[PDB]
Design a binder for this molecule. Structure first.
Ligand SMILES: CCC(=O)Nc1nc(C)c(-c2csc(Nc3ccc(C(=O)O)cc3)n2)s1
Length: 195
């Protein structure tokens, strides 16, 4: 229920007015990349602030699955992106899910490297422009999500702040010291590497 998330955003990502929910959007995507260090073989995560107030997260995990999911008749990726808790990682006895980020984004770009192919899909408020599609060949595996947050959901503090992201990435590095984490700001060229 993408509308259900937009109806109750605080219940998923926190306060939508003081900047904290805005930055929790990034941390949800980063938490999904971090989980692949154990669930897959992720060794490197790159978090970039773009000049148009979007953030991307690139990992070298397994890649969000791309095959057609039988019940929905669309790619698994699309299901993961549009259906709350979908994807085989939610344990109702054990966070939020990339579908929450998609629901609360004006636009989301998804690029997956998996099974020899590059795959791409663009969403607007959680609605795909086209089915996931193959764009080329690759030997890599991984997932890149770049999102532009919805100004219908996020108010007041709406711009991403380098220092808020660096502080949480520095904590995450301490607890995941085998993963290379890079933060880059395209606006001014600032970067930090952890550990
Ligand atoms: C942008 C950073 C990001 O979100 N990376 C992400 N990588 C992955 C891999 C993500 C994800 C979300 S549910 C999910 N399920 C599966 C289930 C099975 C397999 C497999 O059998 O191979 C891989 C992933 N995988 S989310």
């Amino acid at each position: 229920g993408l509308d259900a998330v937009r109806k109750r955003p605080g219940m998923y990502i926190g306060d939508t007015d003081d900047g904290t929910g805005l930055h929790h959007m990034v941390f949800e995507v980063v938490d999904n990349a971090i989980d692949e260090a154990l669930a897959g073989h992720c060794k490197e995560i790159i978090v970039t602030i773009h000049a148009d107030n979007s953030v991307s997260v690139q990992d070298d995990g397994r890649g969000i699955p791309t095959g057609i999911h039988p019940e929905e008749g669309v790619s698994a990726a699309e299901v993961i992106m549009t259906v709350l808790h979908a994807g085989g990682k939610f344990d109702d006895n054990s966070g939020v899910g990339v579908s929450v980020v998609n629901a609360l984004s004006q636009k989301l770009e998804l690029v997956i490297q998996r099974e020899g192919k590059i795959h791409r899909q663009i969403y607007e408020h959680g609605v795909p422009q086209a089915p996931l599609a193959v764009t080329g060949e690759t030997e890599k595996t991984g997932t890149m999500v770049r999102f532009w947050p919805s100004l219908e959901t996020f108010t007041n503090v709406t711009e991403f702040e380098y220092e808020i992201l660096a502080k949480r990435l520095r904590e995450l590095s301490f607890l995941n010291s085998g993963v290379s984490i890079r933060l880059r700001d395209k606006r001014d060229g600032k970067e930090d590497h952890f550990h």
